[PDB]
């Protein structure tokens with residue numbers, strides 16, 4: 457019958473995972489000479505790490521994989537929220553996921569494109585006026601304006617900076633993989649403030665005291681009823697409403713990385729300007745190449761025969777996101793930033809998985825992938841075409857051994873000047 461699963465042995469390898477970061481799984485495959493291995497982590501719990509197209513296709517087979525209950529409790533407490541869409545499976549999930557996906561119309565996607573473009577255009581003067589601009593921060597603030605407006609949440613200009621900071625702390629809060637860390641309680645408090653704020657909007661909308669536009673997240677979520685005819689309770693509704701735009705705000709990570717790429721590979725700036733298709737390819741290449749999501753947790757519902765081993769019923773599963781997006785058999789020279797690779801990509805649901813794999817409607821795949829690519833296209837076109845700027849000496853390192861993925865400096869620019877033909 458099948459072979460015995462190889463192990464990264466140890467009672468609990470969480471510390472070792474954290475020390476090796478986005479390279480943990482590749483390091484283990486390499487040293488064990490295997491495509492699939494088991495490790496215990498998160499308090500002695502076994503997880504079988506799977507990768508590649510075959511790992512992704514199996515991970516998103518709902519007949520054999522459970523996702524409910526597999527996120528670390530602390531990460532639910534800070535990043536996603538109690539009872540969030542990420543936390544449910546089966547009919548309850550498909551029903552609620554349809555609500556998220558219903559927002560992703562052609563018009564709403566066009567709207568997010570236009571918002572992003574207008575706000576960057578409107579921000580030029582501010583940025584010229586600054587001695588230096590930390591792109592990670594400036595983009596998170598700008599994207600807070602985009603995301604709240606797109607979601608139909610009215611956010612007073614005077615609150616945007618605090619909101620952005622709260623979002624930042626939440627987005628960062630997967631850094632310990634569910635373990636204790638110094639910043640955990642601050643992350644919880646950020647979450648409580650943002651949940652309280654949104655809950656009030658939901659209640660006021662349901663009472664008829666405010667009138668968000670039809671088709672926005674706030675409107676649609678406040679009024680939605682599940683397959684049994686019941687609304688979300690107000691707190692859960694606020695939680696899932698946040699899940700429509702916190703991750704939009706999180707695109708600031710990719711904005712920073714994109715400017716990093718454009719800096720390291722200056723030909724890409726010229727190509728963004730010259731080739732209309734190229735900004736899309738560039739955006740896709742940022743998502744593939746840079747680290748953000750390391751892996752995703754699930755559980756085997758039944759014994760699964762996979763790549764010559766048997767994965768036992770009840771054991772954890774970890775889909776390797778970083779490893780799949782850097783798989784040398786999927787991506788020629790996976791550690792080269794090369795937007796042109798997208799000229800030949802067939803659109804598979806199972807290779808380009810930085811925001812999950814599988815199906816939008818029946819799997820837990822990111823609802824916001826289209827938005828992410830849109831926002832990145834517009835933002836990179838802006839920085840490539842609309843302004844010039846200098847990049848001072850700074851710490852540009854992206855440490856692959858440290859979750860979460862960041863440019864150490866945030867990516868700082870100076871001497872911003874609008875590009876204007878005045879002749």
Ligand code: HEM
Nearest residue numbers: 541542700703704706707748749811812820821822823824
């Ligand atoms: C900034 C970059 C983003 C990253 C790296 C990202 C990544 C991910 C990943 C890895 C998942 C989980 C896939 C799985 O569990 O199988 C996910 C789920 C989700 N994403 Fe994103 N995402 C991003 C942006 C967005 C945007 C912009 C939105 C909304 C506008 C969004 C909404 C969601 C939702 C609602 C889910 C949960 C779907 C479900 O559980 O069925 N994401 N995302």
